[PDB]
């Protein structure tokens, strides 16, 4: 009947002789009540990632046209036509999460559609091959992920999933918002009320990415960025800078676009081949990039979701 086997301690795989694996294996017992040989059973069939090790090194911390070519992987009439029919297909759900989190449909649509072109592209890596590779063996992030992955093995138990059939990013991402772990854990909401958070439910997704928004200081009606008429060459630009509107003013920006009460803003600086475009990055703009770090990966959702907002009206 049952078989508790105390005597296999030892698990077999790519992480068999790994002391981070098993000083994890330790903690999940101790601090979670999970049972030792369980664990030991799914982590003998994880598998150590060289490729997701490789791509976690490239990843670690002009004018050519770089923004161009950023922006076109993500607004193409193909990906723009996609999200209207995404938008459309969800449209309730959609004005409900702009109701409750004050997060607007072309922010959800914009997101959704630059992380997995709206469901099409979840990933493919089981996420606890990526999760127990990143915890096991990178020591520069491993602390960071062997929380991702604690956090995704109660999950797995909690929504009693199969934590070895769950794909997603070489970093652990998952579903239509590829959400992290954690953020699963602070932020996703079951927002077809059904009971159960599925990051693979579009509904809950959109929801997801509208608290998510919120929990990071959205404001509600409030512009993103708004494009300067100049140039400011010498000045140190990126998503982190923090300028008072005078100092930008005497920098030899003005914006496009009435700024309202907002006295300081960030300096963009887009790589369009030609030269460069200037933009003043609101707290809107700050918020977009808390969902991933990047000053390209923000305008591209926002822009996106623009599009998708005007295509609709046609
Ligand atoms: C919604 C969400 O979960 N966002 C998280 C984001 O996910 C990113 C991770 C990225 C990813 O999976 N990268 C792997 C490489 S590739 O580009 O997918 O090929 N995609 C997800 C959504 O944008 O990663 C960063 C940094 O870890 C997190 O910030 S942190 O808490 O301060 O660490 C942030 O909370
Ligand atoms: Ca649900």
Redesign the pocket.
Same mark, same amino acid.
């Not at 918002?177 to 992290?180: A, H, L, R, W, Y």
């Not at 808390?290 to 770090?293: E, I, K, T, V």
């Given at each position: 009947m049952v078989e508790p086997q105390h005597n296999v301690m030892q698990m077999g795989g790519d992480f068999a002789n790994n002391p981070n694996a098993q000083q994890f294996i330790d903690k999940m017992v101790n601090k979670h009540g999970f049972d030792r040989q369980q664990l030991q059973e799914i982590l003998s069939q994880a598998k150590r990632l060289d490729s997701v090790l490789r791509?976690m090194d490239n =990843?670690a911390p002009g004018p050519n046209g770089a923004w161009l070519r950023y922006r076109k992987k993500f607004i193409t009439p193909d990906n723009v036509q996609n999200g209207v029919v995404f938008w459309n297909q969800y449209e309730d759900a959609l004005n409900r999460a702009w109701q409750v989190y004050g997060v607007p449909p072309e922010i959800i649509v914009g997101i959704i559609g630059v992380?997995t072109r709206w469901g099409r592209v979840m990933?493919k890596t089981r996420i606890l091959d990526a999760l127990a590779t990143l915890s096991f063996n990178y020591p520069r992030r491993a602390e @960071?992920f062997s929380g991702e992955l604690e956090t995704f093995l109660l999950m797995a138990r909690d929504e009693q999933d199969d934590p070895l059939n769950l794909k +997603?990013?070489?970093? +652990?991402?998952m579903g239509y +918002? =590829?959400?992290?772990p954690?953020?699963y854990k602070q #932020?996703a909401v079951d927002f077809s009320g059904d009971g159960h958070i599925n990051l693979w439910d579009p509904v809950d997704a959109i929801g997801s990415?509208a608290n #998510?928004f919120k929990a990071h200081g959205w404001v509600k009606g409030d512009q993103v960025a708004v494009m300067a008429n100049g140039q400011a060459p010498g000045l140190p630009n990126g998503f982190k800078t923090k300028y008072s509107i005078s100092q930008l003013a005497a920098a030899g920006l003005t914006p496009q676009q009435p700024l309202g009460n907002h006295q300081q803003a960030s300096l963009l600086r887009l790589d369009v081949g030609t030269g460069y475009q200037y933009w003043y990055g609101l707290p809107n703009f700050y918020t977009i990039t808390? @969902?991933?770090?990047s000053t390209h #990966?923000a305008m591209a959702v926002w822009q996106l979701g623009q599009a998708v907002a005007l295509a609709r009206v046609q």
């Open positions: 791509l =990843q992380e990933g @960071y +997603g990013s070489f970093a +652990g991402a +918002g =590829q959400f992290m954690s953020s #932020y990415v #998510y808390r @969902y991933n770090h #990966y």
